[PDB]
Design a protein around this ligand. Sequence first.
Ligand SMILES: Nc1ncnc2c1ncn2[C@@H]1O[C@H](COC(=O)CP(=O)(O)O)[C@@H](O)[C@H]1O
Lengths: 150, 150, 150, 150, 150, 150
Amino acid sequence: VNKERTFLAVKPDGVARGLVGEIIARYEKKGFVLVGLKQLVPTKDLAESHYAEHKERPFFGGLVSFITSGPVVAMVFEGKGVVASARLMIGVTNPLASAPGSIRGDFGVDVGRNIIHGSDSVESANREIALWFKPEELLTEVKPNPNLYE
Amino acid sequence: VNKERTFLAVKPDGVARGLVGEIIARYEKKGFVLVGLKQLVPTKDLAESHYAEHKERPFFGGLVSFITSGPVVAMVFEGKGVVASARLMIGVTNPLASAPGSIRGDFGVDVGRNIIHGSDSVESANREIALWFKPEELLTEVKPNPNLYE
Amino acid sequence: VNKERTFLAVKPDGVARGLVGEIIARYEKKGFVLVGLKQLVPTKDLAESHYAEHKERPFFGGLVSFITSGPVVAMVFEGKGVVASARLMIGVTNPLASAPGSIRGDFGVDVGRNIIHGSDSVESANREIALWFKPEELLTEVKPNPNLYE
Amino acid sequence: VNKERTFLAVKPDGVARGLVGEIIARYEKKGFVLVGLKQLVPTKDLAESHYAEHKERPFFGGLVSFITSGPVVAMVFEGKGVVASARLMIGVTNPLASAPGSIRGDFGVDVGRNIIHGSDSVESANREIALWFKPEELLTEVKPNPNLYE
Amino acid sequence: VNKERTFLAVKPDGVARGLVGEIIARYEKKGFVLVGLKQLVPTKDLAESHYAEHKERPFFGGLVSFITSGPVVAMVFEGKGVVASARLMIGVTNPLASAPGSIRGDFGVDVGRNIIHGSDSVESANREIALWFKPEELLTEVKPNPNLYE
Amino acid sequence: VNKERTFLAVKPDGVARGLVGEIIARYEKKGFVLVGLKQLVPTKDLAESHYAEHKERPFFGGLVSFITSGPVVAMVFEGKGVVASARLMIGVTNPLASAPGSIRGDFGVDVGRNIIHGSDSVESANREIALWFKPEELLTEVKPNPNLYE
Ligand SMILES: Nc1ncnc2c1ncn2[C@@H]1O[C@H](COC(=O)CP(=O)(O)O)[C@@H](O)[C@H]1O
């Protein structure tokens, strides 16, 4: 279904380096629809819930500290296979190993400063979307673009 | 003052044409800092308050009906002379008469669909910011690139 | 009316320098619709007709020889006030005096190699279009982006 | 041989989305020479021959119907290994599986609306070029750029 | 003459903000030829000589301090009317008052951090070039693209 | 360490095709810091020392003649795993097989004119750096950008 959604967030570094517009544009050009958007400074609880999967890792503390150190631009994009697609457009965890053309590939050089976050699954996406946004903050009316889908 | 703020809104036509990222990026590259950002579908009340100065004018109903016809990306930028600078970057009311390099000059062809709105003055800016954003949705700690201001 | 049309031609220098896509892209982003397009090496007669207004001036011979010296990308764009707008987007006769953001301003340095030609008025355009394209090479069904016009 | 040629076509969805210039530019920047170019609305017979390899498949009718539903920008590019290079620049059949940096990777989201067509082999290229372009519409004078080739 | 040259320098703020490539590319795209290029940390004597015309002003000391506060990318471009053209491409002293499309108009917000320096006349250009570059650091043979000059 | 450095050279073909700024900008956007830069016409001595590993191979003379055929823009970038990273951003030896998004992938069509050179290892980078630059021409301290590194 062309109604799948994923949660994307331009991290503090991405926001501080002026890459918000660059990132949003890449997703608009791709053909995905922005159904949620807002800037906020993540709280400690939000950070830890968002990254609950890593709470046991040694870098968890620093991860939470950094994600809450400055503004973050939270977004929700909609479209067929958007979750996996958005991840492909991002690259891989280590920006140095991310291919040119991908977001991390073009702008990052450190895993601890990898510019952006993207849901890794539909299940994670639904959970993350519900975590960062309120229902009222998400569009309900999209309208399929006949130029993007058959 | 380097902390002046201005309200900018990518109107329905701008959002539908996928110009949100492009516009945000132009202001980021300029050196202005994003202090507020969100997508919403303006309520009729909000719209009427926004265009209040035109309530007695014939086209009032039209402006209100359009800005509420679909999603709008609202934002607030901060930096020296941002109010005047932001509109210079936009061009003039008529995108056809706007010079290449400006937003309307590069992307618009109809004054009735001129893509974006920028506060016409500091006074209107302060008024629109308080109207479109709640205090908690605006950064309190800014600090732009240290290479921007003397 | 939003049905106005203008004739644009990327001259031998613009083509040789790889500016075809760049130019076409600017008009597409502006919102104008491509209603005609083709690459050709102009004939002596085609050229003499195109510059017919200068048939008496000494430089006439030069203009004819250059435009027929290599491939040219001829095109027709449609939209409100496209004629005047196209020229504004191109810049002024002398690229050195053309403002940054305009085509000549960004890519030209010589009046004799000014990259592109744009009709100077609606009557010159209708004449130029009929001269360079056969009616069957021009679209009759336009239907541009619905977010461009009020 | 640097005289190799491939047939490329921006299908109706690519034209409708204003991606003609962007695509043309990519190939120009790559170093391939444009030897043929024109916009036209393909006819049913041209389309069926073009998609001959699929005449026995159920999606044949749809492919034919779509490519003939609106304007298409047909082009021919010349250069060393242009056929395979052009496809690599396009990405893969499914835009969602196409890597960022490629045309489909950056702008497509559905196999049925994958923006562009490119010859899959030299045999197909020669066959397609002959189908879409008359000999008169193709340059005979190319002239290799010393900066591009050894 | 098309042999005219000008002296351009990306000041410490421009280098610090990652605008070196962007700037060089604008002049390259314009058609001007790079005849001298190098990054260095200007000494006080170089700085004071460069700004000799302001030697008896209150802002002098400040200009000398900043231009010597970090790496600068000094360069020399050659082409017809390059001096005036380069200035036009830069904008005006005050970036906020610089039109969109110009370097300062697109990237600056403070007159004290206006990104780049450009010679204001052939006289000063010939002086600045000799001040910043040694003979052996400048190309002797240029001969630019024949598609740029008639 | 985040102080690793690599040598990059925009060879004669890259400079001639006006790709200097485009390439510099790619590395700047990536987060790598320019610690050395200058344009020069390599002497035969420098060229042979640069390509020393192939002195006894058939193609040695060719590589030497070409890199000394015109101006070259030599540079040194610094950052975590910059050596390996810069090569990933370059693509592969054969530009035709280089993926879209990489430098050679987006701009080259011939192995003999593959635009740029990047050190293949840390050992060779250090060798090349000392070969092309004098210590005085390289920045000493850089200080890690808090936005780029942990
Ligand atoms: N070895 C590490 N040291 C420090 N920080 C690290 C490390 N690995 C991952 N991170 C950080 O955790 C985030 C989540 O990692 C994930 O598995 C998701 P992702 O990186 O693919 O987007 C990553 O995005 C990144 O910010």
